[PDB]
Write a protein that binds this ligand. Structure first.
Ligand code: CNC
Ligand code: CNC
Ligand SMILES: [K+]
Ligand SMILES: [K+]
Ligand SMILES: [N+]
Ligand SMILES: [N+]
Ligand SMILES: [N+]
Ligand SMILES: [N+]
Lengths: 178, 137, 551, 551, 137, 176
């Protein structure tokens, strides 16, 4: 357990951070993404990418929904910069922005099996630039026609499992990273 | 009034088709577009046309499709930005019950969109019951 | 010791596909699940009090919407009492008219129609589908996208697609803000290929409607609905918000259909213990209830879910059959990847291809799959010749046709030139003669020069923010030496004023003639009746490349 | 300048296939030819005086045979007067019983039944095939050969095939003289896999009957018939010589069917200007007239002829439909290569696989195609996994099932052992223990130790010259410690003694239980009736390898 | 006569069956094969059995099949080598008309194969007309 | 080339091998199904025969275009009893007198796979049989795609050579 809940997350007050919002099972019932990458390693890279850009990283666990879009939305409501990064246990990631529609985003990574620790790094790096009102080049598109044929069934199973931890009305818990 | 034999309108009764600004199908020519005799504002389907298609849909045995066209007919009077606001207000957790009822009163009083108004009030009632209003997530 | 026979088998592409044993409690079962509700309905004073086992006190938004607007209550009790086996027999009986069936199916509850079709095998379902299809003439729809959102390539691929036979074409973006360019490029290219082809640009709901309001699209299809309340909620809509959106498109004279597909509730975590087919049936009724004329279904993007379990592909044909049987236009999927095996993907396609549906594929990829922004289609550009060969082999009209390289080059070139004039006329980032040439002879984006995305996105966003409408495209064309294309564009815009193509299965063929289920009534009555591939259309399909004269 | 789109398409495998434009004059047209005769018949005092526009004075041997023995004259005039469209409708109508149709179809002239089925599309044909199929339960047949006529491999592969589900297995030889060995190897291996599996060795007519008289085969299938007199003549037979041969096989208690297939007359030079389907209809009637219970058709070995022309694959399904419609067992081809494309060969196979026939394939290669001595099958050993996945996808019984490597290996080894003992007992070139283990884990002949063909070739011709019968095989096994296998040999002979498996569609399942059209009547009457994949059989088909349990 | 209700004979009426040495299907065990109490002379289908199957075929509505089985029943009396001889004689360009009629006479007088004899005579007449006799190639 | 010359007759000596070619080999058609000219083919066939110290003769058959029968018309005029049938499209077979027409010693059913080297190996084996020997059967050639690629062409080529068939016409000796 490299993640500890330290209480209901409060809203940021300055444009100096980026919130990393993870699903209700991240680092708990599930500890690796759809292709085996550990959650500990993933969070490590996202954070290093953000901090590397002179921005603080604050992690929270979301409960009202397991859908990555809404997980991210919970994050952008509390982010001091309005910028957030949503991540499901299986790996799916999105960069959201306070003000945008829930199903709209700045950048989306819809094929988790293709993500690497380096991608997770650039993502944290880009999230920070957005926070600083910079217009960074989007993380290069990663697409593969056989991603679904090989992993969609597995994706559905992993999401079904994480979704069992959804708690309606439960506010986000800020997390202390070991 | 209109039936399957009157369809397609463009082929059977083109003169029955006029635009919001009362323009004819023949008025829309490259010449008129270039000289701005006709503009985007002129190119808008009318509530009369949609009600005609509703009658045709009904004659074809498609009652719900016709009802959809009846609603569309009322919505032609509602501005683009207002259409988008109302749609978003109906999405999960966006509105309070009173805001939805206010949209309904507005649709009725300002646009005479009675069917759509009833549609919104119906949603308001069920949204309370199924907890899909602001604050229920 | 190892068996060389099994080592060979282990290497087969099909063994890379995802398969799973049924998980009934979580709905991971395609159809015929012991958890599915027994058909039933109770009505008191004109209002439903019970629907398929569930009391009105426990109705969710979906039950309410379906109970109030999705079933003909006047004959619901009568049909419920009819034998489901007899009804299934009626569906595939060539002598029971489609017009005799629709009055019954539209009075059935979701569970009832599912029970009916579940008594059938795929052969019986296909026999029924050819009869229940709303439009007498089958059609096809293609995806036109590329990894770079290159507008020049989109216009060219779109022209080629329309020339090959697609009557509807769809694009989307790798980069969100590119949307306006993609939409305009798709529309221009499609009209150059064949005036009349309808175009759509799939985006976030509010964004897509706005784009349509500006006049850069002809229709919308990815207007989603879901089978369980929690899933619909994560989809950010309710039956009422989507029903309103449907009427909103119609109020702007734009054709539209909803989109669903078996396995979405499982993929999204809440199947409420029901089979994929039953939940999809709920989506089909939500569509009927909303008054939407058609639906894109047959699993669609979640094809990896039903295909993973037994009878999943049969379930896919079943949901398409239910759609058509309920008198709705059916854009029958065959637009998404689910297998590494050519044998397997072909079997999946033939279920709809053989009998014919309103749109055999709701997304055949008109570009090689590496450029498919919907994560890959069940068929792509490299399968064109195989598709035409099968049409010829079985004397089946699959909606496409063999084409000459010389004609494609000219058509793609004209599309690129027309769009070049559009960009110059509207003051958008230039399209060079080098780019026009590349798009003419390209296979995919790998053959296209890299563009300045920063400049494109800037002007694309300006189109939205400054509300630059479709008439601006018409002018640029007419003022740029493309009066012919400008007229065709104006003609497609004028279709939005009559409401004719808003009807069930409507497409636009020949000289701006609308062709829908209203004026192209499917009149199937067995052999030698209904739509038949013959005459010049048959000659067109027989003319495949490589067919040398024996003499 | 070349289009990269077209350069990519030009490389596709399908474009290596042979296609030709129709050549009506030489009969290079699959069906619906303007040269085909109009249906007609005239009867005087119970004798045909006119057949399909031709007077008895001009009859060739085929006409005489069909006219005197192939048509049920009691209702010929009645059915001739019936509208062909109505008849086609009756064929696919689920509510017109097979038993009501048979008395009418068997009374039609060849031209008449051809006119009837030609009004149908492939979906209608499949809808009809599932109903007209003689045996209620669908089955499958496999090819078991190798380029070296290696005996040990044949025995091993035969056992696996039988274990996978094949109810009939066929072998042939690259070197004629090798015949005797191939047969014995096939028979022993088959019974090891599953006692009851019928075996055949396809050779020159006179030679095969002899091999059967010696008791080295269970049945015969490649008993050829042709559609035109000149071709039949080059085939070295007449309707009377083949009719006599058919009765000869039966007099020895051996089950048998004839073999034909569209395109043979074209391939052999004399189509007399008729379409392939019409000429194949004459072959089907020749078969009926001779009193033969079944037929292997659907182009078979000449598949490259009809596939080359328009509607050729549809014509292949039509000929299978005519066969079943004439109350004959149909072993429906899908046993020969005609394309380089996986997509194309799958579409061709589904025509019979979906509805189901007495033998979906009359020769699915149970070995990799390089080892197939019939010049390649439409499916081979490497497609086993895909075949099982498609069965599961559509809930269709294709006659085969998923297997476990350990079981196959065990079965493979026992067969090599059994055959080894046989060669020892009969004093034939020994089978080293090295060959036994190789054949056990082999995928093809490439993994087998080279043998002394010349040595065996002499011992092979010895068995025929020294009239060494199968009892030497039964004994060579008994002494070798193989009693059960030896007994299973007798059980086959015992079946030959009862004559039960000589009936239409007969196969032997379970504990020597005959399963034919007589005691396994197809009673199809629409959805929920007739053969339906369910119960234990369904579970068997669902349990494929790789199916991971989610929870 | 035997009917479909009597099929399969192996399951319904085993006793009705027998072999070219009179006994039972039961006496067909490996034991008897080794001791040679049962040989090849004992493993030949009888005309009696074929005529039973012919009756069943007829009852099943398959008259041609029945006729085939009837001809087979007759042929059980003809020696294997002679069977091959007659088959070859019927192939293209192998015999003279007289040689075929001689075969028919032999079939009828020596084996009582009346049906087959008629079959051969029929062939002889048609072979002359369609020129498929020795020398016509 | 192939000069007409009178009709052929019996041999009487088993030190020869007859080569029977279809009624178009060297006439209407000059190359096999894959381009190999008839000249080259016949040349290597004769060389392989003479190599074994056997004499080779060539005759043209007209009664049937079927390779099996064309070979039959020859194995009856061959002093050794062995012969070789070759259709214009290339199909070849090694036949022996006294054997059933559709039976043979060796068959080459996939013409597209034959090479000039294959045609010479067929020759020595033929002559090998003429000397009452048991040579190693010529290596089997089998390509599962031979039919998909050439069966249609095969039918067309045979349809054409078949137009030259003439009933009751005896084989005519040939001089290369
Ligand atoms: C399958 C699929 C796909 N979808 Co959807 N989708 C779906 C289905 C599953 C979604 C789910 N949440 O379970 C389905 C049909 C329900 C769906 C729905 C939608 N999708 C939508 C869109 C716009 C898109 N989708 C794609 C991701 C578009 C994909 C095309 C592409 N280029 O990737 C896609 C074809 C394949 C993804 C995949 O299978 N990856 C392989 C899998 C093993 O990896 P994964 O990481 O587990 O995949 C997950 C993500 O892709 C995620 N996801 C899918 N769509 C979205 C959309 C958004 C906005 C977000 C945040 C996540 C997703 O769901 C997958 C399963 O959990 C998209 C790239 C296609 C396109 N270009 O038009 C695009 C996103 C564009 C962007 N925002 O940057 C909708 C908003 C459509 C609508 N009209 O409402 C809607 C959103 C639903 C929601 N609440 O999440
Ligand atoms: C297609 C085919 C095949 N056939 Co046939 N056949 C046929 C058909 C077409 C042949 C034709 N005469 O037009 C068909 C159905 C009529 C046929 C018939 C027969 N065939 C027969 C046999 C035994 C065989 N056939 C094969 C050659 C068996 C082949 C299997 C294999 N291993 O090749 C085969 C599957 C594929 C050949 C091919 O397509 N090659 C590709 C083509 C481009 O090359 P090609 O050189 O032009 O091919 C020609 C030859 O193969 C020839 N041919 C085919 N079969 C024979 C048999 C003999 C005896 C002879 C001399 C030639 C042939 O016909 C082809 C077309 O002209 C065989 C190896 C495998 C088999 N059992 O099917 C086997 C030969 C045995 C051996 N000698 O070792 C018959 C005697 C069967 C019977 N029950 O009577 C019979 C002979 C008819 C005759 N008078 O020629
Ligand atoms: K689509
Ligand atoms: K076979
Ligand atoms: N959308
Ligand atoms: N769904
Ligand atoms: N045979
Ligand atoms: N045939």
């Amino acid at each position: 357990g490299f993640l500890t809940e330290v209480g209901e997350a409060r809203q940021g007050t300055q444009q100096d951070e980026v919130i990393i919002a993870v699903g209700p099972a991240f680092g708990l019932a599930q500890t690796v993404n759809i292709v085996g990458i550990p959650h500990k390693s993933i969070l490590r890279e996202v954070i290093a990418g953000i901090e590397e850009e002179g921005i603080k990283a604050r992690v929270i666990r979301c409960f009202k929904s397991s859908d990555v879009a809404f997980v991210a939305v919970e994050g952008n409501r509390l982010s001091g910069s309005g910028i957030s990064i949503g991540i499901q246990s299986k790996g799916t990631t999105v960069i959201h922005q306070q003000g945008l529609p829930p199903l709209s985003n700045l950048e989306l990574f819809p094929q988790a099996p293709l993500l690497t620790l380096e991608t997770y790094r650039q993502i944290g790096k880009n999230a920070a630039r957005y926070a600083k009102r910079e217009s960074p080049q989007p993380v290069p598109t990663l697409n593969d026609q056989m991603a679904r044929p090989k992993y969609q069934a597995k994706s559905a199973i992993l999401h079904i499992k994480e979704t069992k931890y959804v708690v309606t009305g439960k506010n986000p818990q800020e997390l202390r990273v070991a | 009034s209109a039936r399957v034999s009157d369809y397609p309108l463009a082929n059977k009764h083109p003169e029955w088709v006029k635009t919001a600004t009362n323009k004819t199908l023949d008025d829309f020519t490259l010449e008129n577009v270039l000289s701005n005799k006709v503009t985007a504002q002129d190119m808008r389907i009318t509530p009369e046309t949609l009600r005609l298609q509703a009658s045709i849909a009904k004659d074809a045995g498609r009652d719900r499709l016709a009802m959809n066209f009846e609603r569309a007919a009322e919505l032609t009077a509602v501005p683009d930005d207002r259409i988008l606001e109302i749609y978003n207000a109906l999405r999960p957790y966006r509105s309070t019950k009173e805001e939805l009822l206010a949209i309904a009163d507005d649709l009725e009083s300002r646009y005479q969109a009675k069917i759509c108004a009833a549609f919104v009030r119906e949603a308001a009632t069920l949204y309370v019951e199924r907890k899909k209003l602001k604050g229920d997530d | 010791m190892r068996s060389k026979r099994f080592e060979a088998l282990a290497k087969r592409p099909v063994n890379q596909d995802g398969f799973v044993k049924e998980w009934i409690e979580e709905g991971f079962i395609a159809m015929e699940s012991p958890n599915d509700p027994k058909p039933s309905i109770k009505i008191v004073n004109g209002a439903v009090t019970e629907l398929d086992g569930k009391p009105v006190s426990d109705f969710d938004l979906i039950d309410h919407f379906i109970a109030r607007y999705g079933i003909n209550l006047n004959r619901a009790e009568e049909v419920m009492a009819m034998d489901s086996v007899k009804l299934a027999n009626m569906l595939c009986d060539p002598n029971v008219k489609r017009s005799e069936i629709v009055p019954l199916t539209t009075a059935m509850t979701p569970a009832k129609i599912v029970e009916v079709v579940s008594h059938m095998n795929v052969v019986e379902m296909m026999m029924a589908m050819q009869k229940m299809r709303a439009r007498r003439t089958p059609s096809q729809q293609a995806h036109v996208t590329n990894v770079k959102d290159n507008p020049v390539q989109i216009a060219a691929d779109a022209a080629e697609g329309a020339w090959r036979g697609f009557d509807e074409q769809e694009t989307t973006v790798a980069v969100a803000r590119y949307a306006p360019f993609n939409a305009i490029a798709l529309l221009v290219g499609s009209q150059v290929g064949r005036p009349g082809v309808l175009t759509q640009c799939s985006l976030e709901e509010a964004t897509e409607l706005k784009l349509g309001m500006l006049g850069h699209t002809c229709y919308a299809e990815t207007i989603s609905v879901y089978g369980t309340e929690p899933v619909f909620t994560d989809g950010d809509d309710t039956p009422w918000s989507k029903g309103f959106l449907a009427s909103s498109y119609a109020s702007r004279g734009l054709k539209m259909r909803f989109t669903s597909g078996s396995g979405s509730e499982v993929q999204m975590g809440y199947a409420e213990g029901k089979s994929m087919l039953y939940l999809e049936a709920r989506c089909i009724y939500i569509t009927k209830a909303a008054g939407v004329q058609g639906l894109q279904n047959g699993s669609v993007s979640c094809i990896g879910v039903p295909s993973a379990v037994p009878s999943g592909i049969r379930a896919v044909l079943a949901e398409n059959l239910i759609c058509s049987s309920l008198d709705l236009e059916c854009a029958s999927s065959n637009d998404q990847t689910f297998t590494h095996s050519d044998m397997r993907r072909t079997a999946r396609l033939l279920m709809q291809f053989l009998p014919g549906t309103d749109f055999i594929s709701s997304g055949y990829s008109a570009v090689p799959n590496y450029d498919n922004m919907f994560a890959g289609s069940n068929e792509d550009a490299e399968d064109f010749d195989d598709y035409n060969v099968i049409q010829r082999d079985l004397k089946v009209d699959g909606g496409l046709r063999p084409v000459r390289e010389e004609d494609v080059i000219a058509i793609r070139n004209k599309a690129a030139r027309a769009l070049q004039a559009v960009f110059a006329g509207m003051g958008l980032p230039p399209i060079t003669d080098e780019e026009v040439e590349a798009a003419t002879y390209a296979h995919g984006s790998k053959d296209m020069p890299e563009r300045n995305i920063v400049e494109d996105i800037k002007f694309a966003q300006e189109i939205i923010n400054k509300n630059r409408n479709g008439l601006e495209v018409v002018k640029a064309l007419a003022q740029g030496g493309f009066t012919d294309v400008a007229q065709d564009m104006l003609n497609i815009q004028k279709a939005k004023l009559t409401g004719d193509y808003l009807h069930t299965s409507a497409i636009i063929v020949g000289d701006g003639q609308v062709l829908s289920a209203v004026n192209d009534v499917n009149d199937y009555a067995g052999p030698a009746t209904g739509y038949r591939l013959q005459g010049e259309r048959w000659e067109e399909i027989k003319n495949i490349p490589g067919a040398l004269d024996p003499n």
